[PDB]
Amino acid sequence: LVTNGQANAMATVQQLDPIYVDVTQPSTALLRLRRELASGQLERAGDNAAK
Amino acid sequence: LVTNGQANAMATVQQLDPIYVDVTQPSTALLRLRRELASGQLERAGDNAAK
């Protein structure tokens, strides 16, 4: 038996032509990245923050 | 599938232009601060006590 608006699934379809990747960086590394990238040493250009 | 008013959300739209800061302070220090403020030794300023 199956009912309207239930919570348990009954099949699973999924597409795979691109596939996402959910990576995690810590929030301390955001500050260590941004404080040195804004003023001091390094900068982003080209395909740097893309590929 | 989407049900009428389900539990979980779909996307979180949030505005970041001001931000709130939920500051936790213990209660015994708050009693000590209220006692020293009701007494005549320690008092708060008129313009620097909200910054």
Curated annotation (Swiss-Prot), chains A, B:
Domain of life: Bacteria
Gene induction: By growth under severe iron limitation.
Subcellular location: Cell inner membrane
Loss of function: phenotype: Disruption of MexA, MexB and OprM significantly reduces active efflux of N-(3-oxododecanoyl) homoserine lactone/3-oxo-C12-HSL/PAI-1, but not N-butyryl homoserine lactone/C4-HSL/PAI-2.
Subunit structure: Component of the MexAB-OprM multidrug efflux complex, composed of six MexA subunits forming a hexameric tube, binding to a MexB trimer, which interact with the trimeric OprM outer membrane channel protein. OprM is thought to not directly contact MexB; instead, MexA joins MexB and OprM by forming a funnel-like hexamer anchored to the inner membrane. MexA may initially form a hexameric ring complex with MexB prior to OprM, then OprM undergoes a conformational change as it contacts MexA, allowing the periplasmic gate to open.
Other comments on record: In both X-ray crystal structures approximately the last 100 residues are not ordered.
Function: The periplasmic linker component of the MexAB-OprM efflux system that confers multidrug resistance. Functions as the major efflux pump for n-hexane and p-xylene efflux. Has been shown in one study to be involved in the active efflux of the autoinducer N-(3-oxododecanoyl) homoserine lactone, thereby playing an indirect role in quorum-sensing; but has been shown in another study not to be involved in efflux of this autoinducer. Over-expression of the pump increases antibiotic and solvent efflux capacities. Implicated in the secretion of the siderophore pyoverdine.
Family recorded in the similarity comment: Belongs to the membrane fusion protein (MFP) (TC 8.A.1) family.
Protein name per UniProt: Multidrug resistance protein MexA
Organism: Pseudomonas aeruginosa (strain ATCC 15692 / DSM 22644 / CIP 104116 / JCM 14847 / LMG 12228 / 1C / PRS 101 / PAO1)
Lineage, broadest ranks: Bacteria, Pseudomonadati, Pseudomonadota, Gammaproteobacteria, Pseudomonadales
From-to range in the entire protein, with total length: 178 to 228 of 383
